[PDB]
Coordinates of C-alpha atoms in Angstrom, one line a residue:
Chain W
X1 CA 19.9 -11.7 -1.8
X2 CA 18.1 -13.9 1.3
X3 CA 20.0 -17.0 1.5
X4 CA 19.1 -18.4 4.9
X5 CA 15.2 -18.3 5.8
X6 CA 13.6 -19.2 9.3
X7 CA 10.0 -20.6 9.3
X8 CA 8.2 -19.1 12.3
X9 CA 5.8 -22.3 12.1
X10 CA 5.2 -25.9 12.6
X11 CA 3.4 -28.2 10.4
X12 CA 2.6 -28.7 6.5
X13 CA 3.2 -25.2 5.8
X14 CA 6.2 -25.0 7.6
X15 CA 7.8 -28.4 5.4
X16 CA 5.7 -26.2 2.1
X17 CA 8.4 -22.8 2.6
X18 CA 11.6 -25.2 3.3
X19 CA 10.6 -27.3 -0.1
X20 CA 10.0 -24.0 -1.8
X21 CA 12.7 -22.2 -0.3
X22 CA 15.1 -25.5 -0.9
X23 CA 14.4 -24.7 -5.1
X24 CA 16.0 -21.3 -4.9
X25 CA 19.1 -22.7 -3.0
X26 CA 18.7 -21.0 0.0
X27 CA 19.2 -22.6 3.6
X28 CA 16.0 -23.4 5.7
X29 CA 16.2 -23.5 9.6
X30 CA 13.3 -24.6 11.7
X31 CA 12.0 -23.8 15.6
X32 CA 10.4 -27.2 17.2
X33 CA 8.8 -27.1 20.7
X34 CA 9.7 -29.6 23.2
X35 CA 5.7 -31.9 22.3
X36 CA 7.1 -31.1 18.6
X37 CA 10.3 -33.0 19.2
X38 CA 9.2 -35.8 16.6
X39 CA 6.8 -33.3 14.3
X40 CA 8.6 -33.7 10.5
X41 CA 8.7 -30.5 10.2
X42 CA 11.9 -30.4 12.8
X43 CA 14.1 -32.8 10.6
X44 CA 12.9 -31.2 7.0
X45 CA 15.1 -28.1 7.2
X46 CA 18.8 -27.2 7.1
X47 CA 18.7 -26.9 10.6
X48 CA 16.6 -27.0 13.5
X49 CA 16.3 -25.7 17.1
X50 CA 14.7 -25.8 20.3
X51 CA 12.9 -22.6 20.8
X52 CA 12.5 -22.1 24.8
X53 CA 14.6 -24.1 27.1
X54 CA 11.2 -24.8 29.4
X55 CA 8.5 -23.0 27.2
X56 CA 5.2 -24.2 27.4
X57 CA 2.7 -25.3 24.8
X58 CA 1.9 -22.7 21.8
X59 CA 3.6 -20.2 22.9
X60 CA 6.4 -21.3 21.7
X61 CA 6.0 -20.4 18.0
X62 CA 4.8 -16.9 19.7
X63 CA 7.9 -16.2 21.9
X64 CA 9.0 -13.3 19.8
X65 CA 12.3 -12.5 21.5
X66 CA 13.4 -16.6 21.4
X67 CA 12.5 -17.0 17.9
X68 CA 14.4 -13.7 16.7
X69 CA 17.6 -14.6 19.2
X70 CA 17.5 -18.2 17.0
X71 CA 17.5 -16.5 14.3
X72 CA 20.3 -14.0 14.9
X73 CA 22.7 -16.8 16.1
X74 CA 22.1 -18.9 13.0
X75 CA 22.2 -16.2 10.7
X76 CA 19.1 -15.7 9.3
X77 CA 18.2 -13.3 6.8
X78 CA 14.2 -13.9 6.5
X79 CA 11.9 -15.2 8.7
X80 CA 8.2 -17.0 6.9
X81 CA 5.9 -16.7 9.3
X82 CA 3.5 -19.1 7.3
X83 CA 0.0 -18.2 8.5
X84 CA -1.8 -18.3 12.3
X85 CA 0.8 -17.5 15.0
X86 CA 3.0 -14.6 13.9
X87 CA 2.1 -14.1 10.6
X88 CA -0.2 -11.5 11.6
X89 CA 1.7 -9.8 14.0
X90 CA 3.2 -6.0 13.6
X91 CA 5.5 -6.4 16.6
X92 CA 7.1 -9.7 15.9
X93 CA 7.7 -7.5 12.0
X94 CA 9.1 -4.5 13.5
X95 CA 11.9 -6.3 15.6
X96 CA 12.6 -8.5 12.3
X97 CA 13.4 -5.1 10.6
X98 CA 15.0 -3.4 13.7
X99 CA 17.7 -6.6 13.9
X100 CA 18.0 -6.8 9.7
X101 CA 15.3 -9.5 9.0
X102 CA 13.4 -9.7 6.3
X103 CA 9.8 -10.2 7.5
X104 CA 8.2 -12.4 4.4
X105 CA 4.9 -10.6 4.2
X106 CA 3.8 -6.7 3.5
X107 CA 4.9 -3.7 5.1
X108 CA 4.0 -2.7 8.9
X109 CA 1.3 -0.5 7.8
X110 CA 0.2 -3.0 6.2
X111 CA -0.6 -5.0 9.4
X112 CA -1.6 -2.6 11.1
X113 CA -4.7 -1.2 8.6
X114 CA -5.9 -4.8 8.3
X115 CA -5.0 -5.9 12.3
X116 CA -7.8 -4.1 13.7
X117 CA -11.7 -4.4 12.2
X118 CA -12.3 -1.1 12.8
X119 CA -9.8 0.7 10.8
X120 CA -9.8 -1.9 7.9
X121 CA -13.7 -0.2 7.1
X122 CA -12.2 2.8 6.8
X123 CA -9.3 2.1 4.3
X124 CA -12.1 0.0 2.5
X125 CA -14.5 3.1 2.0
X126 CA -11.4 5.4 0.8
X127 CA -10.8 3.1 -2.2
X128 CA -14.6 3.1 -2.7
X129 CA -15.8 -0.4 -2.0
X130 CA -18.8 -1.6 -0.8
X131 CA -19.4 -2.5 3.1
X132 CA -22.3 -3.7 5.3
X133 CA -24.8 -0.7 4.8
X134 CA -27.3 -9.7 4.9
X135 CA -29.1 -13.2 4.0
X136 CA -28.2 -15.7 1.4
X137 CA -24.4 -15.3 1.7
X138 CA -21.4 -16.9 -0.3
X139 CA -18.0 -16.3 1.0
X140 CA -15.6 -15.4 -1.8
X141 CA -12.1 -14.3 -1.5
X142 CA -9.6 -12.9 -4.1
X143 CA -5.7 -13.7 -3.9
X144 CA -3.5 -11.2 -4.9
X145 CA 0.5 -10.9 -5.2
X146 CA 2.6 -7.5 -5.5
X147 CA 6.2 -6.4 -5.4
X148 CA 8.1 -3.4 -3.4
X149 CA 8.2 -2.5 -7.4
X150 CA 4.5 -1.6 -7.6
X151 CA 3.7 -4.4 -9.9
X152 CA 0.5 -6.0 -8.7
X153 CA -2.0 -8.7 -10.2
X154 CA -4.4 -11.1 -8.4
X155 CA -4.6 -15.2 -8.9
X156 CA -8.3 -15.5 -9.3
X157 CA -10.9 -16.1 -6.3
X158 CA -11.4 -19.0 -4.2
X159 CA -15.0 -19.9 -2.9
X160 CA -15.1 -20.3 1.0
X161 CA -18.8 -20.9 1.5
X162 CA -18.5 -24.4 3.0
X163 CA -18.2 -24.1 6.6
X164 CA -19.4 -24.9 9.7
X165 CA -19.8 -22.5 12.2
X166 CA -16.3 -20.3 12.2
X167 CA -14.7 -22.7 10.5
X168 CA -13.7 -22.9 7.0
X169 CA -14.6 -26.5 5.6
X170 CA -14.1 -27.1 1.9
X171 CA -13.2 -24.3 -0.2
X172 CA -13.7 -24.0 -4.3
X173 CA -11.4 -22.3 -7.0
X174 CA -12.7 -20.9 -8.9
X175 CA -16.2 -20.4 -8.6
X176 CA -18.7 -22.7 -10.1
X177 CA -22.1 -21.1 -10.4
X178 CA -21.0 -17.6 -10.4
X179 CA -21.4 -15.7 -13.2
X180 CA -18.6 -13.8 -15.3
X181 CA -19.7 -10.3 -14.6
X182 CA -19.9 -11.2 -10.7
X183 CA -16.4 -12.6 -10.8
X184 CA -14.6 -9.6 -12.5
X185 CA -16.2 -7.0 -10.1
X186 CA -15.0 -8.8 -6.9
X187 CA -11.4 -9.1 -8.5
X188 CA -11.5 -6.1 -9.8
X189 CA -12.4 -4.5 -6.4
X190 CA -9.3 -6.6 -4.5
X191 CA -7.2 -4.8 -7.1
X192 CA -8.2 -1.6 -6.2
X193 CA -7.9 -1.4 -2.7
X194 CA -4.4 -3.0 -3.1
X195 CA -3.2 -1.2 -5.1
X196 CA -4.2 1.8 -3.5
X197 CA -2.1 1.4 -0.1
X198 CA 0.8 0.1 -2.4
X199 CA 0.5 -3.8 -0.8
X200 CA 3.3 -5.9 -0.4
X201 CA 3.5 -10.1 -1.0
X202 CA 0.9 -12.3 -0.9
X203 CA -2.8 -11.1 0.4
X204 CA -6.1 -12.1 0.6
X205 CA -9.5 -10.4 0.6
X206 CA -13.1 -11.4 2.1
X207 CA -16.2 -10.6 0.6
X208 CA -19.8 -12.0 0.8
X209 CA -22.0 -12.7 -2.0
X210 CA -26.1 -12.0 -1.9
X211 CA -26.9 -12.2 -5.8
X212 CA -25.4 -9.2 -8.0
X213 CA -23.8 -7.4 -5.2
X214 CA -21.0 -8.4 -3.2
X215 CA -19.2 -6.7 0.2
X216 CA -16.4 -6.4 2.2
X217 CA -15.6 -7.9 5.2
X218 CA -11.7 -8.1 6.1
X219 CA -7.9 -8.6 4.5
X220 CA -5.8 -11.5 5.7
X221 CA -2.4 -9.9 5.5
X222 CA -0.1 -13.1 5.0
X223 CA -0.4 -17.0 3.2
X224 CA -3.9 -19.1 3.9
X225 CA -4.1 -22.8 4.1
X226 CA -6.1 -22.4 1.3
X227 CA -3.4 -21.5 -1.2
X228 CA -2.8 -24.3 -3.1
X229 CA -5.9 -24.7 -5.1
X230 CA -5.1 -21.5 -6.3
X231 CA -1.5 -23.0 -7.4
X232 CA -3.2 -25.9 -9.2
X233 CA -5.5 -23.6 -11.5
X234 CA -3.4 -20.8 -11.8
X235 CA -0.2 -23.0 -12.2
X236 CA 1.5 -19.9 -9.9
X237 CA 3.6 -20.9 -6.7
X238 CA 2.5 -18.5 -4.2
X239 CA 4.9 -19.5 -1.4
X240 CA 7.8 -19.4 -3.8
X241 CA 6.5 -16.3 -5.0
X242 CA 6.0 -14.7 -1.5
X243 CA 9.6 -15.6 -0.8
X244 CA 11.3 -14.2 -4.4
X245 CA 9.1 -10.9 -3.0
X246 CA 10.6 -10.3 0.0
X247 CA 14.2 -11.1 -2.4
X248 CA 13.5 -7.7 -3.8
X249 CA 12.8 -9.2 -7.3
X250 CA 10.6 -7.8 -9.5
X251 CA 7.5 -10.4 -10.2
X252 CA 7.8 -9.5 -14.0
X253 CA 11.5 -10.9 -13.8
X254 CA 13.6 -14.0 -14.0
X255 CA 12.8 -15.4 -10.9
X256 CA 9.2 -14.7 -10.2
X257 CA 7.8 -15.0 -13.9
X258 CA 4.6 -13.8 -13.7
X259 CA 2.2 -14.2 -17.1
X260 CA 0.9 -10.5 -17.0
X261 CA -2.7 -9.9 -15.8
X262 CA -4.4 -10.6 -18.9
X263 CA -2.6 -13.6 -19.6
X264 CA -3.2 -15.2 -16.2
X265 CA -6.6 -17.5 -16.3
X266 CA -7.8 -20.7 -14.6
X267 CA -7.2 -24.2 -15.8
X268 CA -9.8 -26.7 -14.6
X269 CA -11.1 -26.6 -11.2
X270 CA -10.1 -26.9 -7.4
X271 CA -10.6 -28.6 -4.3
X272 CA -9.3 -28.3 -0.8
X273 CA -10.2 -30.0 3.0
X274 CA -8.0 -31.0 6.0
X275 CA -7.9 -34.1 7.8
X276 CA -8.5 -33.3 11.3
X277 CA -9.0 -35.7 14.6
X278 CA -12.3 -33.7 15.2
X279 CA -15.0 -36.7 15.5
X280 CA -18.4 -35.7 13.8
X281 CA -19.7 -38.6 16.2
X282 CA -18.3 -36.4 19.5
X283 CA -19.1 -33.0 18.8
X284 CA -15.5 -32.2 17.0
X285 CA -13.6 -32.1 19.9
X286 CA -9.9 -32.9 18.6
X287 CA -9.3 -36.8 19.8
X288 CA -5.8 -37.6 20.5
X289 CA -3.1 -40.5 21.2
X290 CA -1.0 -42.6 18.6
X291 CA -1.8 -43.4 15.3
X292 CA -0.9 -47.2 14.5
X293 CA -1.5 -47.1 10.8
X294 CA -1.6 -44.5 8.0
X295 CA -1.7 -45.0 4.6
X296 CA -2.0 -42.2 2.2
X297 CA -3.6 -41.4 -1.5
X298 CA -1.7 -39.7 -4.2
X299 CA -1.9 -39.7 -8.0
X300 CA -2.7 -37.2 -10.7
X301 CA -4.2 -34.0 -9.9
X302 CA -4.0 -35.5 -6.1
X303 CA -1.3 -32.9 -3.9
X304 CA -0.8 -34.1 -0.2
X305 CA 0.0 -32.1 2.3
X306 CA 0.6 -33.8 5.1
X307 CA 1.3 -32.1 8.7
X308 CA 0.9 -34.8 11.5
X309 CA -0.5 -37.5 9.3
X310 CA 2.7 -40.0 9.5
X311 CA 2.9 -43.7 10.7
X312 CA 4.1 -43.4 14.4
X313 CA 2.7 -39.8 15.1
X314 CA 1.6 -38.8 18.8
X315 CA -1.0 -36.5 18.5
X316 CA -0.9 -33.5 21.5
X317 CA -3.8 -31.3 22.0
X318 CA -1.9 -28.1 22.2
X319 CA -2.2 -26.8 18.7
X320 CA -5.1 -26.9 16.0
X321 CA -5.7 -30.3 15.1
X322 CA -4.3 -30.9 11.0
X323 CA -3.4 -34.4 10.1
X324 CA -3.1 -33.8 6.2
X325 CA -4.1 -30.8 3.9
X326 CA -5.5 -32.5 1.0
X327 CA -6.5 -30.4 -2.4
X328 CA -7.6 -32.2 -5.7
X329 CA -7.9 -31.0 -9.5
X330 CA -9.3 -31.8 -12.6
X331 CA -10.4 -30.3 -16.0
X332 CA -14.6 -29.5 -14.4
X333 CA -15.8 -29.7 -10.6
X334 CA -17.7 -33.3 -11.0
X335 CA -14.1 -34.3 -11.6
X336 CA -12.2 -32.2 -9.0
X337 CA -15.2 -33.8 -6.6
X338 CA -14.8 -37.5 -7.8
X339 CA -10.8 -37.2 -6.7
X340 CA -11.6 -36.0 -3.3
X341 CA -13.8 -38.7 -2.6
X342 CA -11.9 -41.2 -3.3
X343 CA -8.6 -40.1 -2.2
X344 CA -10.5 -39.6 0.9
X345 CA -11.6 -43.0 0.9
X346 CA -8.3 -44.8 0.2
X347 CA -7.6 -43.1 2.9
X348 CA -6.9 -45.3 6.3
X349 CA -6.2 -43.7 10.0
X350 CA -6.4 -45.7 12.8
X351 CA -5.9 -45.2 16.9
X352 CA -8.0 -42.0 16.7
X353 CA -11.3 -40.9 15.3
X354 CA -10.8 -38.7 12.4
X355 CA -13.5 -35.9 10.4
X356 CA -13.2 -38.3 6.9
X357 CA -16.4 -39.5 7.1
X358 CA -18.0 -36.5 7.8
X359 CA -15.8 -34.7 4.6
X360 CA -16.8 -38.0 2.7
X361 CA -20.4 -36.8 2.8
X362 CA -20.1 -33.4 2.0
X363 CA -18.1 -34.1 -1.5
X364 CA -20.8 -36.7 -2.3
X365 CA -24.0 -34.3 -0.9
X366 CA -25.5 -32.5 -4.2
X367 CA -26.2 -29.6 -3.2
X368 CA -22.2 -29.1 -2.5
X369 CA -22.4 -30.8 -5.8
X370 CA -24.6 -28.1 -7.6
X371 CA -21.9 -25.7 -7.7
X372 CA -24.9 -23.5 -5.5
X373 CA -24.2 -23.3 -2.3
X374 CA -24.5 -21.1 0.7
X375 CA -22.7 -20.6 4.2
X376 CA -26.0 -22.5 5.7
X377 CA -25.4 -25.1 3.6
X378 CA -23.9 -27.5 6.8
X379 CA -26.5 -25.9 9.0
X380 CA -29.5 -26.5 6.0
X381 CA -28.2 -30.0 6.3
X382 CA -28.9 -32.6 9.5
X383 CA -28.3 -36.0 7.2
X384 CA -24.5 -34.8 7.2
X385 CA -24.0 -36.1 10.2
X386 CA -24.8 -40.0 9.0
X387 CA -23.5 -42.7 11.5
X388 CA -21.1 -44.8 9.2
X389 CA -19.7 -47.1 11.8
X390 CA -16.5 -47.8 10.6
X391 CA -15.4 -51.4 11.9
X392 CA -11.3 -52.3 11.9
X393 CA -10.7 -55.4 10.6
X394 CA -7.6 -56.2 9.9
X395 CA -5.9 -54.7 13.3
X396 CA -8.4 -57.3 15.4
X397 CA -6.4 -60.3 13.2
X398 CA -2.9 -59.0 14.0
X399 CA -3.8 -58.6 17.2
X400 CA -5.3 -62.2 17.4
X401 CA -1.8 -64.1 15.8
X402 CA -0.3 -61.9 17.5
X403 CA -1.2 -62.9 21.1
X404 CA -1.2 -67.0 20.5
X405 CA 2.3 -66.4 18.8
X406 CA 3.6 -65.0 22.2
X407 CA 1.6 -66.6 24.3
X408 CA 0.2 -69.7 23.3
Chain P
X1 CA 8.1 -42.1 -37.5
X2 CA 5.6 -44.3 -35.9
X3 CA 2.1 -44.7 -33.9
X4 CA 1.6 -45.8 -30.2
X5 CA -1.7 -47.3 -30.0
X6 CA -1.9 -46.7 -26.6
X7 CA -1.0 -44.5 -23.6
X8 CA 2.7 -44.0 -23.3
X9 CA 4.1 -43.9 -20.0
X10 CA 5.8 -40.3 -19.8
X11 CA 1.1 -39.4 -20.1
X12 CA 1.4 -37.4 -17.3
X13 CA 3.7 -34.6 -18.7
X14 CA 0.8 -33.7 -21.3
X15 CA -1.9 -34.2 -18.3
X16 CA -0.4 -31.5 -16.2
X17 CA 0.2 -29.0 -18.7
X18 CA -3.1 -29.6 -20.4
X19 CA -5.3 -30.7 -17.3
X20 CA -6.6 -33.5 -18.6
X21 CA -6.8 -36.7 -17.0
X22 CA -6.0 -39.1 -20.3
X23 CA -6.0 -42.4 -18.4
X24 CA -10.0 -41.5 -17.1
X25 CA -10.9 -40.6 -20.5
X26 CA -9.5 -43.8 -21.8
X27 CA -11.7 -45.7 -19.5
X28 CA -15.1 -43.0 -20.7
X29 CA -14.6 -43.5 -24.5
X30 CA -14.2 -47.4 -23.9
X31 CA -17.7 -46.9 -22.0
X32 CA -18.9 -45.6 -25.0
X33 CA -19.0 -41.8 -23.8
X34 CA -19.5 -38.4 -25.8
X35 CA -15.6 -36.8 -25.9
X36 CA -17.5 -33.0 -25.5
X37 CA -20.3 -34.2 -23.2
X38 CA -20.5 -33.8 -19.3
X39 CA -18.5 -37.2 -18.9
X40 CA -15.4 -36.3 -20.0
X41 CA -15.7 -32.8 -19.8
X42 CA -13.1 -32.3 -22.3
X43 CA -12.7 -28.7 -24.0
X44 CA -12.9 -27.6 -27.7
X45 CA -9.6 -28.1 -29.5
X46 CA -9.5 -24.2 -29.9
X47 CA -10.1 -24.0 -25.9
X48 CA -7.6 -26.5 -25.0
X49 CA -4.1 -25.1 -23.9
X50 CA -0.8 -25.6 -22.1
X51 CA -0.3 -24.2 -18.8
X52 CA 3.1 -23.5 -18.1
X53 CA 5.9 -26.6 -18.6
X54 CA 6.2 -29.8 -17.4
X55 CA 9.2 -32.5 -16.8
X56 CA 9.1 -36.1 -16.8
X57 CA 12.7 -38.2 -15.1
X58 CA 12.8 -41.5 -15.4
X59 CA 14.6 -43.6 -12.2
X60 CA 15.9 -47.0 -12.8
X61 CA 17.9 -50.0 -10.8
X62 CA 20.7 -49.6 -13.6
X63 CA 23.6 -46.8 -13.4
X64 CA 26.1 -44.8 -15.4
X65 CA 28.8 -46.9 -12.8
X66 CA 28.1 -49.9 -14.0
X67 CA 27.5 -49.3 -18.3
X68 CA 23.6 -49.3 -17.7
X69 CA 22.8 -52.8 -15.8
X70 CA 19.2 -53.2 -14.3
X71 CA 20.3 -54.5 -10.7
X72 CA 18.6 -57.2 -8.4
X73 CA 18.8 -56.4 -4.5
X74 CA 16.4 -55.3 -1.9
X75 CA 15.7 -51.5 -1.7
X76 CA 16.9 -51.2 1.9
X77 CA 14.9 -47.7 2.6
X78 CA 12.8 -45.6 0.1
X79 CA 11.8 -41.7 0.3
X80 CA 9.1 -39.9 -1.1
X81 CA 8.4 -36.0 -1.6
X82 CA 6.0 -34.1 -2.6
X83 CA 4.7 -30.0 -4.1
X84 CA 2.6 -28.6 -6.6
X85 CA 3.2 -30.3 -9.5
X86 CA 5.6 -32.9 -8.3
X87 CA 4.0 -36.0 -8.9
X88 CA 5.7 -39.5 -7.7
X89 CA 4.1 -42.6 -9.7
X90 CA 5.5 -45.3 -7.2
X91 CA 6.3 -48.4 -9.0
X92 CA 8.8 -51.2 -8.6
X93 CA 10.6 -49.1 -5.5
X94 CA 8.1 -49.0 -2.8
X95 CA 9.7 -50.8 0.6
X96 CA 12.2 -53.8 1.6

């Protein structure tokens, strides 16, 4: 029935829901802030508008009452809230209900179980899973998909062990190393607590791996950036999925078409990292200014995502630094590894610093390459942080014809 | 009806469904490569399978307007896109 949708978001996920929601004809309208008045994402949509006359910086895609009065006068009848701003928030869901809006997510009590770490234990331990009664660890997470039908399945797992500090890297899908046995329990224990509280759209859950035991640690109640490489092996569209959900439609149907359980496997494997303006040579602080050249990769089994990565883009420090999400795929992992690295390579950003080099590394480090790999494995490693200099050629020469051209 | 002795240029259709990267292994078996060893990675016929359906469109200079005529001109402006499993192989439109 939705036939106008409003992205609560800015960015590539914002441009990935109008795209999607572009394929089942219906309208897409966008919410810009005034430092987003160039961002793509404003001119990608149907329709596009200023969310708060004099609103500040990232606030703006958190003004609730704003949003939902842009969305009333344009006639929306579903708001995406993509993922890290609203998507996680009960309130901003109850007044979408209470004025007739679909909220594209699960249900209130959904949010609210999984919003607070200390009631999320105690769902956990009702549907018998394991918890923290911790060395060694690999961070695995299950996707899963169900309908206000009861129909539920999951899309595999997705390994998040690469990261920094907080900070999720390069993630994996689906696992390489891990045995069979391992892989079906951890599934098999998303699917239970899911379907237990009767779970709505698209959700992920956290575990932790030690060797043959795995535990709980929380439920992300909404889309990840993550997503696609679970798209590429699974061949699924979540966003388009999430979307058809909140439609009513049952996942089984015309519209969703989803291969029952058994018939849902992986094809290959999967790689995903962003493209940030954190400098690896400047303790990551986000650099910022103009970009004067980008050039981009593509190709098979190559998916761009790109979210301020574009020729003339200013970059302002107000919101989490993403230039371009960029996943890669092939038939085995040394393959899905090889892509990266070069796409990542042809790659060419200039004006700011950007993490590249530092991603560059990690893809070609073997123990990343091992398929074995733990959440030390940045910290267990100091020669990550190699000084490639980096020297712009080319830009030096323009600049040189440039000036006697003018000037003599 | 007939063999191409080669790779044809609508590969990519079979690539996506399959997930095989034909063009790579071309470049493997030339190298003198096993077809089942680490290399090429490449399953056993009874292992490899389609994964859902692909599409392949082809865009030319010549139109239904004017009875199929491959046109000169500069391209004055061209626009990519982009999604899972939307793959542009840029060509002979790429700027002015």
């Amino acid at each position: 029935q939705i036939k106008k949708l409003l992205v609560a978001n800015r960015g590539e996920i914002a441009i990935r829901i109008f795209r999607a929601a572009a394929e089942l004809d219906i309208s897409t309208v966008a919410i810009y802030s005034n430092e987003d008045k160039s961002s793509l994402h404003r001119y990608k949509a149907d329709e596009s508008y200023l969310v708060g006359s004099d609103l500040g910086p990232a606030e703006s895609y958190l003004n609730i009452e704003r949003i939902i009065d842009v969305a009333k006068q344009a006639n929306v009848d579903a708001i995406h809230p993509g993922y890290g701003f609203l998507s996680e928030n009960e309130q901003f869901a109850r007044r979408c209900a209470e004025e007739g809006i679909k909220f594209i997510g699960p249900h209130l009590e959904h949010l609210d179980m999984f919003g607070d770490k200390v009631k999320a234990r105690t769902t956990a331990i009702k549907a018998d899973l394991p918890v923290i009664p911790i060395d060694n660890p690999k961070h695995i997470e299950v996707q899963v998909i169900g309908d206000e039908h009861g129909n539920i399945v999951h899309l595999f797992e997705r390994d998040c062990s690469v990261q920094r500090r907080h900070q999720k890297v390069v993630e994996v899908a689906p696992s390489v190393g891990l045995s069979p046995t391992l892989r079906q329990r951890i599934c098999d224990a998303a699917i239970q607590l899911m379907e237990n509280i009767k779970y709505v759209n698209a959700g992920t859950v956290e575990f932790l791996v030690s060797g043959d035991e795995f535990f709980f640690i929380e439920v992300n109640p909404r889309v990840q950036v993550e997503h696609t490489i679970t798209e590429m092996v699974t061949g699924i569209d979540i966003v388009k999925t999430q979307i058809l959900v909140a439609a009513g439609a049952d996942l089984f149907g015309e519209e969703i078409n989803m291969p029952q359980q058994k018939d849902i496997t992986t094809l290959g494997y999967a790689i995903q990292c962003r493209i940030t303006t954190e400098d690896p040579l400047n303790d990551f602080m986000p650099d910022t200014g103009t970009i004067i050249a980008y050039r981009s990769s593509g190709g098979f089994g190559v998916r761009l995502d790109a979210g301020d990565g574009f020729q003339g883009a200013e970059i302002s420090p107000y919101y989490d630094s993403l230039l371009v999400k960029l996943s890669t795929h092939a038939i085995s992992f040394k393959q899905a590894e090889e892509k990266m690295v070069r796409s990542l390579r042809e790659m060419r950003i200039r004006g700011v610093k950007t993490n590249i080099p530092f991603l560059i590394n990690v893809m070609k480090n073997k123990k990343f390459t091992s398929g074995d790999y733990t959440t030390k494995f940045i910290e267990e490693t100091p020669e990550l942080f190699d000084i490639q200099p980096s020297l712009d050629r080319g830009t030096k020469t323009l600049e040189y014809i440039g000036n006697v051209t003018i000037n003599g």
